[PDB]
Amino acid sequence: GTILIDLSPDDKEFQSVEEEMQSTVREHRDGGHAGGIFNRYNILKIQKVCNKKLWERYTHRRKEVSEENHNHANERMLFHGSPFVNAIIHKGFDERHAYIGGMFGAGIYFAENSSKSNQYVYGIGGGTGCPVHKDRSCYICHRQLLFCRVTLGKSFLQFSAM
Amino acid sequence: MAHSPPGHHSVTGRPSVNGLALAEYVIYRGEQAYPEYLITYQIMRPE
Ligand SMILES: O=c1cc(-c2ccc(O)c(O)c2)oc2cc(O)cc(O)c12
Ligand SMILES: [Zn+2]
């Protein structure tokens, strides 16, 4: 079902997506242990993910949530990093993309800081890092994350000592 | 997979100690997210 369309670096859409990635890097309290040591990225490619079935599934749930929350889907764009990005783009998010041991329960996690999602690209806590060099701070290997459309509806506010 | 607290659709994890960390969010249904952009990248070694 899925087709991937390359965006041109001269297109304003590419440029706005890169700006979201780059502007939401921060330092992490682990010193870079999980995700590596960096202040910015080299963006190599940005692809638009197109799948009519998955889209209609999303927008059907979106309208349900809107109607339960004073006509406000509370839709955001957020980052998701994991080793399963290739399954997500063909089959969608599901229970097998849940962080069963996460702070807020077994669910699917997203971040406003692109650098937070980067800590999960090679696994929980960065796993053992890249496949080729076993290096969580690899400057060579190509990484992938998703910039996702996410419906929050009425969101329970949980203040977190983090 | 867990469920949202009753009467809610998601959880917002708002960091209270580090005032530069932005929010994290959890959903409990896969159909509440669409993977719109696939970004391929390298992290860069600082100078
Ligand atoms: O992108 C995130 C991805 C994941 C994640 C964690 C465990 C998994 O088995 C998985 O498939 C994904 O966990 C997070 C946990 C966070 O607190 C913030 C995040 O952005 C993520
Ligand atoms: Zn590597």
Q: B8-43 in b/e burial notation, b at 16+ Cβ within 10 A?
A: bbbbbbbbeeeeebbbbbbbbbbbbbbbbbbbebbb
What is d(CA A108, CA A105) in angstroms, rounded to the nearest whole number?
Answer: 9
From B47, B1, B10, select the one nearest A98 (Cα to Cα): B1
φ/ψ of residue A92, rounded to 5: 95, 170
CA A6 – ligand 1 centroid, Å: 25
- Closest residue CA from atom 14 of ligand 1: A109
Domain assignments of chain A as residue spans, ordered by start: 1-162
CA of A38 to the centre of ligand 1 (A): 19
Rounded Cα distance between B41 and A121, Å, is: 11
Chain B CB contacts of A65 under 8 Å are 9, 32
Name residue B25's beta-bridge partners.
A110, B12
For A32: left if phi > 0, alpha if psi spans -120 to 50, otherwise beta; the answer is left
CATH of domain B1-47: 6.20.320.10
Give one word for A112, left, alpha or beta, with left for phi > 0 and alpha for psi -120 to 50.
alpha
Distance separating alpha carbons of residues B20 and A86, to the nearest angstrom: 31
Closest by CA position to A46, among listed A19, A23, A18: A18
- How was this entry determined? X-ray
The CATH architecture that domain A1-162 belongs to is Alpha-Beta Complex (3.90)
Ordered by start, the domain boundaries in chain B are 1-47
Measured from the Cβ of residue A78, the count of other Cβ atoms closer than 10 Å reads: 26
CB < 8 Å from A in window 3-42 of B: 4-5, 7-18, 20-42
- Count of CB atoms within 10 A of residue A44's CB? 12
Size of chain B in residues? 47
- Name the strand (E) or helix (H) holding A155: strand A155-160
Give the closest ligand to the alpha carbon of residue A28.
Answer: 1
CB of A156 closer than 8 Å to CB of A87 = no
Given a contact cutoff of 8 angstroms between Cβ atoms, the answer to whether A43 and B39 are in contact is yes
Residue bearing tokens 């580090």 = B18
Nearest CA to ligand 1 atom 9: A99
Backbone angles phi, psi at A118, to 5 degrees: -60, -30
Taking the CA atoms of chain B, what radius of gyration do you get in angstroms? 16
Q: Which atom of ligand 1 is nearest to the CA of B13?
A: 17
